[PDB]
Design a protein around this ligand. Sequence first.
Ligand SMILES: O=C1NCCN1C1CC1
Lengths: 300, 237
Amino acid sequence: MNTVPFTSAPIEVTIGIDQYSFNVKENQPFHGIKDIPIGHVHVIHFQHADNSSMRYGYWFDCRMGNFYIQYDPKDGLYKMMEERDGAKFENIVHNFKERQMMVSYPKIDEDDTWYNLTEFVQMDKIRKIVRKDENQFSYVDSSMTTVQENELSDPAHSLNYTVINFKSREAIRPGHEMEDFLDKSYYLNTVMLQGIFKNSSNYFGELQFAFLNAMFFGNYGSSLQWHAMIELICSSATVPKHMLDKLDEILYYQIKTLPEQYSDILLNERVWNICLYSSFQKNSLHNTEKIMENKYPELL
Amino acid sequence: GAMNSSNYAELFNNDIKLFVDDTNVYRVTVHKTFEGNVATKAINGCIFTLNPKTGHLFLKIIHTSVWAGQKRLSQLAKWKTAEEVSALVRSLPKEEQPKQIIVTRKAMLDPLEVHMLDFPNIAIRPTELRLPFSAAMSIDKLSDVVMKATEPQMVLFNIYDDWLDRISSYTAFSRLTLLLRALKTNEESAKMILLSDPTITIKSYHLWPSFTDEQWITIESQMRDLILTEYGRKYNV
Ligand SMILES: O=C1NCCN1C1CC1
């Protein structure tokens, strides 16, 4: 079990740690989050009380270093930092724990939600989507645009998701126009899985990361990416059986975790109706179709 | 974006553009089978690809053999249209290739966009105009060229005959759409109007009759009456 200490909490803020959240008051004696499960990536995220504009946060993996949070009054945000002095860090944490100044990562033993949302998400792949090589952790916020959004403007602050575009020479083999546009299996299996992602685990990892950024930061381009990656699978007639079964599980837990009140902005009616009712895979997503029909029947 | 009455004069500027109409590509007769079921029999069709400024009509005849052994023919027909238009563009010298292609039905947008990916600078546009190009097969010589075909073939026609020697391309297009609208609303009467007078002939190298300027005004008036007549007979007005 790992710990992310806070130097202090000088501004009132709602702090998220994965799917949990808690409110911290201005100058409240808060000094961090303990008992964080080892073995998963995590995200620690922030929404200031005085300006709910810009949700922002940090993806990290406690196996890759000792990380802490410190508010910067010049840039006006809570910043993640790495402490290289291991003994200084252990002594800081032990003091804050003895004074019980830390919240406990509140995981129910039965509860596999976070695993199910991050099964294929790796910190090394996150750091290729979010480029800032001097840090072991990755900053994301509500406003960051994707490479594909910038093609249609600061490149260093972009989300370098894999560009998917159904009307592109990459997606469409010369002479197979109709076939490839109506059945995207070539684009999924040859171009994307064999060519770019190398395997379905990396594809699912990017899909899951895209969803989590959409959910936690309201990042619009991430939501676009999540839906495009779903649509590419659903619009393929030929998909490995194990990929379809895993996709059904992935989407089930995503739909389950979505805040009910954000479904209007996080779910694209067209993609979901197409995927569940018109596509090649309309009959292959049983768990996802069942939770969608019981939780968001209005969208459909 | 979309092409409509507001930007109608754009059709007659000096940027090369083509209308593509796919309504006569897949044509069938519906009939009963010996067992009393229903079946279709395809007949020859055509892509109607028209430069509205020059009158040049690239008519790509679609022979029924292209449908043999194929499924979902109405969907295939859109992609076949897009394939043939793309092949036409590639066959033209660069300085003759269009800068825009306007499709008369929105269902042609994605097929044509996908087939034209190699041409990112050619704009594929829909239109809000309800153009009467389906009635192209009411032009006798055109229908004849399509029905007699025994293999695929594309023929270059001028749909304005020699009209541009005397009128502008705006006026010629207006005359064409009026003739086609009339033929579409009542083919028999329209054709009666156009041929009633045996002294006005269609030249061997022309599609429409050799009307004087004054006779075209009479003809044009009679087509408006017909279109209004039918609009009454239809709606009871
Ligand atoms: O203008 C006409 N009328 C039909 C045949 N002819 C074209 C092919 C040379």
